[PDB]
């Protein structure tokens, strides 16, 4: 459908818009390139491990690789919906969001290739709860925006993408990687990637907070919808976490070899904490 006119011909970019500022920060802080990371030491670590210890890191990598690919594809409808609404500054920012996720897909795929498991199909570590979030709910909620860009639909998309997938699962995954592999002194290239990912993620979550809060600001009754959509996905979040935990408790060999005291209770409480903390970053009033 036709353009009526163009903001940057009639006027200029809104230089003070919060998403324009976030866009500027993303260009400044987003120079990293997965292709520059040295994975040579990761190859050697992984080869040195036994079959049993080798398996241990794969479930978390399986979760991340599919998750990065899902969001790369599933962010496009949000960019379209906001473009149609004429929110140019949000679109500018979303180009950095999409390009970030592309590099995240690239980072985990380079690690898989480097350590010699590219040919292995890691879908075996996606349980039913994971599939519900990443194979189904995420794409349903985002694709909806093509035909329905009501405040209800936008809130649900932002909640599932930014507050659950990124703000709850991804954040807890970064924490888990550091608690286990950083302590062991294993997989330095991967952990360097994880640090860059964690920094990009801060902006992604802030876009979701901005989006949800500007809709709640119009009608405080959307606050209840946000809470409800958070709670709907909790059982799948914790059902995936419990599955990973249970795989971890059965495959102890890595924790024994590296003298790691993997506290699964601490990791569980971190996920619960992340979830409640995201809930609290949205104000009912304002």
Please report, in range form, the residues annotated as the binding site for Mn(2+). 68, 101, 104, 129, 166, 201, 204
Who's near 9: CB < 8 A, 6+ residues apart?
none
Choose between 144 and 278: whose C-beta lies nearer to a copy of itself: 144
Name every residue whose Cβ is closer than 8 Å to that of residue 92 and which is 6 or more positions away in sequence: 13, 19, 20, 23
Closest CA to 100 of 256, 8, 210, 206: 206
Stretch that binds ligand PLM, among 34-42, 61-69, 151-159, 212-220 (CB under 6 A): 61-69
Interface pattern 93-112 for Na ion (x via CB under 5 A): -------------------x
In the shown chain, the binding pattern of residues 252 to 281 toward ligand PLM, with x for contact by CB under 6 A and - for none, equals ---------------x---x----------
Give the integer Cα–Cα distance in Å for 61 and 59: 5
Q: Count of residues binding ligand PLM (CB under 6 A)?
A: 21
Rounded to a whole number of angstroms, the minimum distance from the CB of residue 219 to Mn ion is: 31
Binding flags for Fe ion, 108-147, as an x/- string (CB under 5 A):
----------------------------------------
Contacts of 93 (CB under 8 A, 6+ apart): 19, 20, 22, 23, 26, 207
Could you say which of 144, 203, 204, 236 contacts Fe ion (CB under 5 A)? 204
Compute the distance between CA of residue 97 and CA of residue 161 in angstroms, rounded to an integer.
12
DSSP states of 220-258: TTHHHHHHHHHHHHHHHHHHHHHHHHHHHHH--HHHHHT
For residue 37, the 8-state DSSP code is -
Which token pair is 93? 């920012």
Three-state SS for 24? helix
The alpha-helical segments, DSSP class H, found in 159-221 are 171-177, 183-184, 188-216
Give residues with Cβ within 8 angstroms of 147, minimum separation 6: none
Q: Taking CB under 6 A as the rule, does residue 96 contact ligand PLM?
A: no
Identify what 250 binds: a copy of itself, Mn ion, Fe ion, none; CB under 5 to 8 Å per kind. none
Is there binding between residue 65 and a copy of itself (CB under 8 A)? yes
Q: Does 126 bind a copy of itself (CB under 8 A)?
A: yes
Give residues in contact with a copy of itself (CB under 8 A). 1-13, 15, 23-24, 27-28, 31, 33, 35, 62, 65-66, 68-70, 72-73, 76-77, 79-80, 83, 88, 91-92, 95-96, 98-99, 101-103, 105-106, 108-109, 112-113, 118-119, 121-123, 126, 134-136, 139-140, 143, 146
Give the interface with ligand PLM as residue ranges (CB under 6 A): 60, 63-64, 67-68, 71, 101, 104, 165-166, 169-170, 172-173, 176, 204, 241, 244-245, 267, 271
């Amino acid at each position: 459908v036709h353009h009526d006119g163009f903001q940057t011909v009639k006027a200029t970019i809104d230089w003070e818009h919060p998403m324009f500022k976030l866009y500027e920060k993303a260009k400044r802080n987003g120079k990293w390139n997965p292709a520059d990371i040295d994975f040579s030491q990761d190859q050697k670590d992984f080869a040195s491990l036994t079959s049993e210890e080798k398996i241990s890191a794969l479930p978390l990598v399986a979760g991340f690789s599919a998750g990065e690919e899902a969001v790369t594809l599933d962010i496009l409808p949000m960019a379209h919906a906001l473009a149609r609404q004429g929110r140019l500054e949000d679109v500018l920012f979303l180009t950095t969001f999409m390009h970030d996720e592309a590099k995240h897909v690239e980072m985990f795929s380079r690690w898989q290739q480097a350590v010699g498991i590219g040919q292995m199909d890691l879908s075996v570590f996606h349980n039913d709860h994971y599939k519900r979030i990443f194979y189904e709910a995420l794409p349903e909620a985002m694709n909806r925006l093509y035909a329905d860009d009501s405040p209800e639909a936008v809130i649900r998309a932002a909640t599932v993408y930014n507050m659950i997938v990124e703000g709850t699962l991804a954040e807890s995954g970064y924490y888990t990687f550091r608690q286990i592999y950083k302590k062991a002194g294993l997989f330095p290239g991967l952990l360097q990637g994880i640090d860059y990912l964690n920094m990009d993620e801060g902006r992604h979550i802030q876009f979701g907070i901005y989006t949800i809060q500007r809709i709640v600001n119009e009608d405080e009754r959307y606050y209840e919808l946000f809470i409800r959509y958070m709670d709907e996905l909790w059982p799948h979040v914790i059902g995936y976490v419990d599955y990973l935990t249970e795989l971890g408790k059965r495959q102890q060999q890595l924790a024994r070899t590296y003298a790691l005291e993997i506290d699964y209770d601490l990791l569980r409480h971190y996920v619960i904490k992340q979830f409640n903390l995201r809930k609290k970053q949205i104000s009912r009033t304002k």
